[PDB]
Design a protein around this ligand. Structure first.
Ligand SMILES: CCCCCCCCCCCCCCCCCC(=O)OC[C@H](COP(=O)([O-])OCC(O)COP(=O)([O-])OC[C@@H](COC(=O)CCCCCCCCCCCCCCCCC)OC(=O)CCCCCCCCCCCCCCCCC)OC(=O)CCCCCCCCCCCCCCCCC
Ligand SMILES: CCCCCCCCCCCCCCCCCC(=O)OC[C@H](COP(=O)([O-])OCC(O)COP(=O)([O-])OC[C@@H](COC(=O)CCCCCCCCCCCCCCCCC)OC(=O)CCCCCCCCCCCCCCCCC)OC(=O)CCCCCCCCCCCCCCCCC
Ligand SMILES: COC1=C(OC)C(=O)C(C/C=C(/C)CC/C=C(/C)CC/C=C(/C)CC/C=C(\C)CC/C=C(\C)CC/C=C(\C)CC/C=C(/C)CC/C=C(/C)CC/C=C(/C)CCC=C(C)C)=C(C)C1=O
Ligand SMILES: COC1=C(OC)C(=O)C(C/C=C(/C)CC/C=C(/C)CC/C=C(/C)CC/C=C(\C)CC/C=C(\C)CC/C=C(\C)CC/C=C(/C)CC/C=C(/C)CC/C=C(/C)CCC=C(C)C)=C(C)C1=O
Ligand SMILES: CCCCCCCCCCCCCCCCC[C@@H](O)O[C@H](CO[C@H](O)CCCCCCCCCCCCCCC)COP(=O)(O)OCC[N+](C)(C)C
Ligand SMILES: CCCCCCCCCCCCCCCCC[C@@H](O)O[C@H](CO[C@H](O)CCCCCCCCCCCCCCC)COP(=O)(O)OCC[N+](C)(C)C
Ligand SMILES: CCCCCCCC/C=C\CCCCCCCC(=O)OC[C@H](COP(=O)(O)OCCN)OC(=O)CCCCCCC/C=C\CCCCCCCC
Ligand SMILES: CCCCCCCC/C=C\CCCCCCCC(=O)OC[C@H](COP(=O)(O)OCCN)OC(=O)CCCCCCC/C=C\CCCCCCCC
Ligand SMILES: CCCCCCCC/C=C\CCCCCCCC(=O)OC[C@H](COP(=O)(O)OCCN)OC(=O)CCCCCCC/C=C\CCCCCCCC
Ligand code: SF4
Ligand code: SF4
Ligand code: SF4
Lengths: 115, 318, 215, 156, 171, 176, 96, 70
């Protein structure tokens, strides 16, 4: 309830700021002023053309490493279990495999960007 | 009465951002053998007000090739998330008392990147697109290390509630328990707020204005306000997490003053770091985060899992 | 562009952020200076050399003056030559300050620029005291120099020189051993000695590859 | 009256805000950019007047044409001037930008940047000293202070 | 009509209001717009013409269009969807009066409505641009330079001869 | 005679290796940089309070042009046109004729200050110290036409700045 | 030493002619230093000196509030200095 | 100054003081001056609900003293 009111207040304040910024000043837009910005001249191609991604392999690994966070965040609560020896074995197992996966991608030159 | 609390949280943060602009300019000036603004008002006090009034009286620009909906949405999302990131911070009583506060900060911080992404894409310009892809790379660099550092630190807290961090540090700061994690967390917060030596997305020398190259006037101002508010909020979070002030239940003013002093110290440390160092290459930042920070983070996560068990020092509040 | 030095239109082809081709388009500061010189006398053409490399004025004047003196078969007096070499070394200090500080600014070290441009300002004061112009001087002429040094200039030059080493030390403290600076600069733009000699390089561009040459 | 007093006060506030916050484009061509840099240096400290360089033209208030304008560069200068959101001001620096200067009779030099963009202040010199450009900037500030936009609007 | 004109620009500007309100659907109004450069050239020629001292000139374009066809062509060059609807005179005068209360430049006025939905007089006895040496420039060769600013990014690079010149009421 | 700048290799001592490891792990060099910048924070800034304070100048300084007079009030310029012939930028235009008393004086004397390069060759060439570059440098205008000086403006500049131009000449004419 | 710099600041406040003069100079010249009065101008300008300052700050002028026909309380410029004080103020000579 | 940077830092500190103190004062004003109750779990919420019911004024903060047990 209060978080909804807070979010609404923040979004409304930002929107009113945009509205003020767009309706208070004197607008004079003509074709040359709104043209795309290159440093001095006109662009050759488009900004919508494909832009090659040299770290594409690290990005996919980020998805798999991100989900290893969902497995480790309940660890503060798991420390309150009675049988700590099986919990600590499983928590360390979950991090050794995460370390071994990082080591594997490192040694196979997976962490290097495409040249 | 709760709306009064929201306003009394929102307006002072905006004023503090406005005067952090002045404080950064003056600190960088004096660190560079000059003065910084002193002419407008006594000691440059009125400079932020002049800048704010000048920007919101200047014509806004909509690019011909830009897609207007995302172009307008991006600054609104940036500023609204920057203001929202403040509600669970206990100073010493949070505005919104969350059972999972740190998770909320992580989620809103992750969502705040799409402001830069969508602004850079909707600008429909090459420099803005380059800045947006640099933002993608930066997030990929810092996110996992930041989350694991947070987990390792909070393992001594017993929960994700931010108000419990004060009880954790009744007697000692957690910087004396996890100073390596504190160092890596400080670097991660530098990289997360796009601050020097990691101000890659703006890329001023490299990419002109970068992602917000197209933006002008009020919309540009909103992006700037969001950036500064994020700086202050992250330093406040760092102060709560690692430098625990003493809270007297019959006098919260002492906690508030001590907290504010520590937050100011950390923000001035950011300004100092900006004034002292050159800029990374954004591929070098990724290698720093994945080849140096990540192995230590995993090793120290294992260490901070094992320590309370073998020490018989497990925190309460399952 | 901040890193384009004002009038460089660099047309690059990029795959991702990688550079596939650099095509420098120059001539955006082509003033047709050589043609104008053909329309002036030898004295009138001297300020063009001030304006050629506007970071090293005395050195351009000195080169033009040496050429004209060689063609005239005359010889500058000894005090003139000593003044020329002194102000050439001062000009070298000015140019190297500008080069190093702007390079650091482009890489990201914004701070040493302000520290070093105070020394640059003092050297501009030296220029203005000897000639009346902060940078365009025109003090060095094809027969010697225009006027004599004022009676207190050498003392002030000595005062500046006895302190400049500490400023260089602070610069090196900021940059030399920094790992960020080294990562940005080490093994970047590596050129071999043979390629440097063939491609027409000179100066530091040759001496960085190990070629033992200095005019 | 009452409305004219209000519009006069609003003119004062707007002009004060505009002149105190002058953001020049990071733009320079030739010799005079060095003296502009020296104006940015600690001795003169253009920041202390509220004047800071910003790279993007969309975030610029003033263009300082510091150096020679050539026929090859004139379209680029006009392009970056047109992309400045208004209000915008142009300061001409040195002989080359003022009237062509020492390359006035050249085949490749524009005889004065005012053939390309309207100029607000003409700073003379070759190059003007850092105090000369500072004097020009403060003169532009006074000129901005003297403008009356809402008084004229109210009297239409 | 020209770049900074309120004619071509005015029609293009009403696209936001969902539909295009036209009195009697613009089928009983005829317009003969003239290029701005032609008017400027005619004024300059009248300045330096000795025989044009006490004369009166009518500066009109080469083509007469029905208002519906003209607005349809305007929206076609701008590549916007054209959704015209008829509006009665009283209601559209009322909305003009409502817009008139703007302390700034009004978006439209009642007088603007009257002038927009008024046919253009034909005065053949008066001298025209052809008597000052000016060959009137047709709208089809100059509409793109005004209406390209009103296009979206999708249609921004479209050429001039792609939009099928409009139907002309020529005598 | 030459020296090497970057051909030193580090010692492989155990304590030296440990020192390098401590530098890598604890960021000692970055702290040194922070210390340098902090030391600069506590120094006195080099900024002067313009316009209430001015940067130092010299008698040789070349500033706004001016036409001078003799102590009797007669103009010094005799229309020899040596300044016009030497001007690298062709910024001077001169016309002359006999005056009503037969004196050799100019009728036109313009200097285009948007052509002038402020080199001072004109005052080195002048045999009677008529044309000089004064000490004024704060004369920015709001229009281009205001920088196209004619004889009236230059004579007025001389009359306005004589008290300083004469003193600057007195302090430097022995070097000329 | 801290108490002494506080005394120096208080003396700067007192030596400007009370709080009103202190505020006036602080809002006009953006500086509250006090120096020996070298002399006054024909038009109302005052020229001070402080040889303990570094080269560039050791001389300054407090501009008049009323030049030929305009009010120069806020709007001052360097072109308001007469040529003799112009020579003294730009350090072309040591003689006022 | 370097002590002229202090006014800006002081203004920032004054601005940053307001959120925490205002929040604490608002919590005390709307909870009878006793540090608004925290309910991370359902047991504490049940305690607040029971307190709300017992008071009779429909407010949780109005504590009922041993004097309510005749
Ligand atoms: C009904 C179903 C739901 C409708 C959703 C909103 C209602 C649509 C009404 C108009 C919106 C867009 C207006 C427009 O297109 O240009 C107008 C107008 C036309 O100008 P133009 O230059 O001629 O047009 C250029 C071309 O036409 C081409 O112009 P373009 O390329 O810019 O068009 C792009 C636009 C056009 O869109 C369309 O094609 C049709 C609209 C349908 C969009 C719905 C798709 C569903 C997506 C997911 C669901 C979103 C939530 C829906 C909620 C509904 C239930 C209440 O696409 C969008 O706007 C999509 C963004 C909307 C999502 C907002 C959610 C915020 C996300 C924040 C993060 C979330 C955090 C976790 C929670 O542009 C302007 O005048 C400028 C201002 C308009 C944009 C301001 C910001 C957008 C409006 C806010 C939306 C409400 C959010 C709450
Ligand atoms: C927070 C702690 C503040 C402690 C403090 O202000 O003392 C700085 C005082 C500044 O000395 P300094 O700048 O090294 O020496 C320059 C002369 O004292 C330069 O002395 P001066 O002749 O320019 O003195 C003018 C006078 C008057 O200056 C003003 O009224 C303008 C500044 C007012 C700012 C409010 O300055 C003051 O007496 C005020 C000192 C700071 C008070 C704030 O020395 C210390 O107490 C350092 C303590 C360690 C701080 C870390
Ligand atoms: C190396 O050069 C550079 C610098 O050094 C000189 C800089 O400082 C610098 C940083 C930019 C500065 C010029 C700071 C600019 C100041 C801001 C843009 C002004 C923002 C202030 C407002 C928008 C905040 C809102 C104003 C209100 C008063 C706040 C309260 C809000 C109400 C609702 C109440 C850059 C980028 C730079 O490049
Ligand atoms: C060339 O000059 C002109 C202008 O200048 C630039 C104009 O603005 C102008 C009027 C057009 C305006 C810019 C209006 C633009 C904004 C909208 C049209 C406002 C109306 C939209 C609604 C209020 C949306 C609200 C949602 C509904 C459900 C109610 C005209 C006609 C014009 O000709
Ligand atoms: C028999 C032949 C097997 C051949 C096939 C081998 C392939 C599988 C690998 C080994 C088999 C895994 C079986 C483990 C099942 C778990 C249940 C059992 O082991 O008891 C657990 C014992 O816990 C131990 O930790 C078991 C795990 C130890 C092994 C470490 C993982 C290594 C397995 C190798 C495959 C992993 C892939 C990556 C290689 C490193 C829990 O006991 P406890 O906690 O009292 O009771 C819980 C119930 N409570 C709540 C009522 C109290
Ligand atoms: C409510 C939101 C909208 C308004 C928000 C306004 C925010 C607060 C207003 C800020 C007040 C500051 C303006 C006054 C400072 C001027 C300082 C003084 O020096 O001005 C002098 C002249 O007076 C000023 O020009 C007055 C300008 C202000 C006029 C009154 C302000 C009216 C405020 C009305 C706001 C109402 C807006 C509400 C709309 C919804 C000339 O100074 P100047 O010399 O150049 O500056 C130093 C240069 N030196 C060194 C040579 C001296
Ligand atoms: C968040 C930080 C910033 C705060 C956001 C709002 C700041 C409020 C400051 C108010 C200052 C007053 C603004 C006045 C400037 C508005 C833009 C402007 O200058 O336009 C001038 C324009 C020129 O028109 P013409 O001369 O007829 O045509 C010339 C073109 N051919 O004149 C006008 O129309 C001005 C009209 C008065 C504007 C009303 C201002 C009232 C205050 C609104 C504040 C809103 C805050 C909420
Ligand atoms: C006051 C009159 C209000 C009219 C609003 C019209 C908005 C519109 O679409 O028109 C464009 C309009 C004005 O531009 P011009 O037409 O060129 O100027 C005309 C005046 N000279 O542009 C704008 O102002 C857009 C500003 C945004 C309006 C507010 C609505 C935005 C809603 C976004 C919410 C989504 C945020 C999601 C993030 C939060 C999630 C946690
Ligand atoms: C955007 C993403 C929304 C994130 C919402 C996070 C809110 C939150 O976590 O607060 C927690 C809080 C209580 O949980 P505890 O921490 O356990 O403490 C209370 C128990 N004693 O949860 C709540 O209050 C839930 C109340 C409603 C949930 C909020 C839903 C918000 C969803 C955002 C959608 C935005 C508008 C919809 C479309 C937008 C654009 C089209
Ligand atoms: S005016 Fe003189 S110093 Fe300036 S760019 Fe031209 S030649 Fe160089
Ligand atoms: S200073 Fe040089 S360019 Fe200027 S008028 Fe004299 S001779 Fe000509
Ligand atoms: S100013 Fe001097 S050099 Fe020039 S014409 Fe007159 S007398 Fe001759």
């Amino acid at each position: 309830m209060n978080i909804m009111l807070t979010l609404l207040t923040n979004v409304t304040l930002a929107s009113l700021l945009v509205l003020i910024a767009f309706w208070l000043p004197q607008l004079n837009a003509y074709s040359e002023k709104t043209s795309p910005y290159e440093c001095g001249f006109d662009p050759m191609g488009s900004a919508r053309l494909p832009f090659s991604m040299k770290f594409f392999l690290v990005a996919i690994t980020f998805l798999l490493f991100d989900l290893e966070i969902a497995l480790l965040l309940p660890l503060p609560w798991a420390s309150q279990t009675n049988n700590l020896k099986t919990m600590l074995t499983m928590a360390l197992f979950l991090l050794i495999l995460l370390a071994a996966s990082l080591a594997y991608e490192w040694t196979q030159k997976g962490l290097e960007w495409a040249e | 009465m709760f709306m009064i609390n929201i306003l009394s949280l929102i307006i002072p943060i905006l004023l503090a951002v406005a005067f952090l602009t002045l404080v950064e300019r003056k600190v960088l000036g004096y660190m560079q053998l000059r003065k910084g603004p002193n002419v407008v008002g006594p000691y440059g006090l009125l400079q932020p007000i002049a800048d704010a009034l000048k920007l919101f009286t200047k014509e806004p620009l909509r690019p011909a090739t830009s897609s207007i909906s995302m172009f307008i949405i991006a600054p609104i999302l940036a500023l609204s998330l920057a203001l929202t990131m403040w509600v669970p911070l206990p100073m010493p009583y949070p505005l919104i008392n969350m059972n999972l506060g740190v998770l909320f900060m992580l989620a809103m911080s992750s969502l705040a990147v799409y402001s830069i992404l969508w602004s850079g894409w909707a600008s429909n310009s090459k420099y803005a697109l380059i800045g947006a892809l640099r933002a993608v790379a930066q997030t990929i660099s810092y996110e996992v290390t930041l989350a694991i550092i947070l987990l390792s630190v909070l393992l001594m807290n017993g929960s994700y509630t931010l108000s419990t961090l004060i009880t954790t540090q009744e007697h000692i700061w957690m910087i004396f328990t996890s100073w390596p994690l504190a160092m890596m967390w400080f670097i991660s917060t530098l990289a997360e707020t796009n601050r020097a030596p990691f101000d890659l997305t703006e890329g001023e020398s490299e990419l002109v204005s970068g992602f917000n190259v197209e933006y002008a006037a009020g919309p540009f101002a909103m992006f700037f306000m969001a950036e500064y508010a994020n700086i202050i909020m992250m330093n406040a979070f760092t102060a709560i997490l690692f430098l625990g002030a003493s809270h007297d239940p019959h006098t919260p003013e002492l906690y508030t003053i001590n907290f504010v002093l520590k937050t100011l110290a950390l923000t001035i440390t950011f300004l100092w770091i900006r004034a002292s160092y050159p800029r990374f290459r954004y591929d070098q930042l990724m290698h720093l985060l994945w080849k140096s920070f990540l192995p230590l983070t995993l090793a120290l996560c294992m260490w901070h899992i094992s320590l309370p068990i073998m020490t018989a020092s497990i925190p309460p509040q399952s | 562009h901040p890193a384009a030095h004002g009038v460089l239109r660099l047309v690059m082809e990029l795959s991702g952020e990688m550079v596939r081709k650099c095509d420098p388009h120059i001539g955006l500061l082509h003033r047709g200076t050589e043609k104008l010189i053909e329309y002036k006398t030898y004295l009138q053409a001297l300020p063009y050399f001030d304006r050629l490399d506007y970071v090293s004025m005395m050195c351009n004047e000195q080169a033009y003056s040496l050429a004209v003196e060689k063609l005239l078969n005359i010889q500058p007096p000894p005090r003139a030559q000593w003044i020329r070499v002194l102000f050439g070394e001062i000009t070298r200090l000015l140019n190297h300050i500008m080069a190093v500080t702007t390079h650091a600014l482009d890489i990201g070290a914004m701070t040493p620029f302000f520290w070093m441009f105070e020394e640059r300002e003092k050297m501009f004061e030296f220029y203005e005291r000897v000639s009346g112009a902060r940078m365009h001087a025109a003090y060095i002429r094809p027969g010697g120099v225009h006027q004599d040094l004022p009676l207190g200039l050498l003392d002030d030059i000595y005062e500046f020189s006895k302190n400049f080493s500490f400023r260089i030390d602070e610069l090196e403290e900021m940059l030399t051993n920094n790992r960020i600076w080294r990562n940005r600069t080490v093994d970047i733009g590596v050129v071999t000695a043979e390629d440097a000699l063939n491609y027409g390089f000179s100066g530091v561009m040759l001496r960085g590859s190990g070629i033992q040459w200095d005019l | 009256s009452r409305g004219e007093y209000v519009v006069a006060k609003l003119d004062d506030l707007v002009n004060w805000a505009r002149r105190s916050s002058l953001w020049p484009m990071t733009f320079g061509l030739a010799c005079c950019a060095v003296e502009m840099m020296h104006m940015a240096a600690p001795r003169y400290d253009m920041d202390r007047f509220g004047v800071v360089f910003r790279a993007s033209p969309r975030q610029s208030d003033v263009m300082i044409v510091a150096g020679t304008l050539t026929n090859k560069m004139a379209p680029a200068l006009r392009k970056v001037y047109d992309q400045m959101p208004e209000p915008r001001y142009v300061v001409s620096m040195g002989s080359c930008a003022n009237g062509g200067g020492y390359y006035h009779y050249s085949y490749s030099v524009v005889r004065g940047c005012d053939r390309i963009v309207p100029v607000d202040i003409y700073v003379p010199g070759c190059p003007p000293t850092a105090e000369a450009l500072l004097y020009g900037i403060l003169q532009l500030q006074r000129k901005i202070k003297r403008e009356k936009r809402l008084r004229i609007w109210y009297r239409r | 009509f020209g770049r900074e004109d309120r004619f071509l620009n005015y029609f293009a500007s009403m696209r936001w209001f969902g539909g295009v309100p036209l009195i009697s659907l613009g089928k009983e109004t005829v317009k003969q717009p003239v290029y701005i450069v032609d008017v400027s050239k005619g004024i300059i020629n009248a300045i330096k013409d000795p025989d044009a001292k006490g004369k009166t000139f009518a500066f009109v374009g080469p083509n007469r269009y029905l208002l519906f066809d003209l607005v349809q062509y305007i929206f076609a060059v701008a590549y916007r969807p054209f959704l015209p609807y008829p509006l009665p005179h009283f209601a559209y005068r009322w909305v003009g009066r409502l817009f008139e209360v703007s302390p700034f430049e009004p978006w439209t006025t009642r007088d603007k409505v009257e002038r927009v939905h008024m046919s253009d007089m034909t005065l053949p006895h008066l001298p025209g641009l052809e008597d000052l040496g000016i060959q009137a420039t047709p709208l089809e060769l100059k509409a793109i330079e005004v209406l390209r600013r009103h296009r979206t990014y999708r249609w921004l690079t479209s050429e001039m001869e792609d939009v099928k010149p409009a139907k002309t009421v020529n005598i | 005679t030459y020296k090497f700048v970057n051909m030193r290799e580090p010692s492989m001592d155990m304590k030296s290796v440990t020192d390098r490891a401590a530098q890598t792990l604890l960021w000692t060099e970055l702290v040194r940089g922070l210390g340098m910048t902090l030391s600069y924070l506590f120094r006195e800034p080099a900024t002067i309070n313009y316009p209430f304070e001015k940067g130092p100048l010299s008698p040789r300084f070349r500033g706004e042009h001016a036409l001078r007079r003799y102590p009797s009030g007669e103009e010094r310029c005799i229309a020899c046109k040596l300044c016009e012939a030497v001007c690298p930028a062709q910024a001077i235009t001169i016309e002359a004729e006999p005056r009503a008393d037969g004196s050799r004086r100019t009728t036109r004397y313009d200097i285009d200050m948007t052509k002038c390069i402020y080199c001072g060759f004109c005052q080195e060439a002048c045999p009677v110290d008529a044309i000089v570059e004064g000490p004024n440098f704060e004369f920015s205008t709001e229009t281009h036409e205001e920088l196209l000086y004619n004889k009236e403006k230059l004579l007025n500049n001389g009359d306005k700045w004589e008290a300083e131009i004469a003193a600057n000449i007195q302090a430097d004419y022995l070097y000329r | 030493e801290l108490v002494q710099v506080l005394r120096r600041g208080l003396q700067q406040v007192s030596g400007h002619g009370g709080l009103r003069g202190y505020l006036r100079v602080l809002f006009r010249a953006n500086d509250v230093r006090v120096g020996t009065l070298v002399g006054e101008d024909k038009y109302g300008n005052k020229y001070y000196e402080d040889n303990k300052q570094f080269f560039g700050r050791h001389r300054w002028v407090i501009y008049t509030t009323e030049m030929n026909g305009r009010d120069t309380f806020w709007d001052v410029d360097g072109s308001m200095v007469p040529p003799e004080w112009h020579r003294w103020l730009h350090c072309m000579t040591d003689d006022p | 100054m370097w002590f002229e940077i202090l006014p800006g830092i002081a203004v920032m500190a004054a601005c940053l003081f307001i959120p925490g103190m205002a929040t604490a004062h608002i919590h005390k004003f709307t909870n009878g001056g006793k540090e608004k109750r925290v309910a991370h779990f359902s047991y504490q919420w049940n305690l607040m609900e029971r307190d709300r019911r017992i008071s009779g004024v429909n407010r949780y903060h109005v504590t009922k003293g041993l004097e309510n047990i005749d």
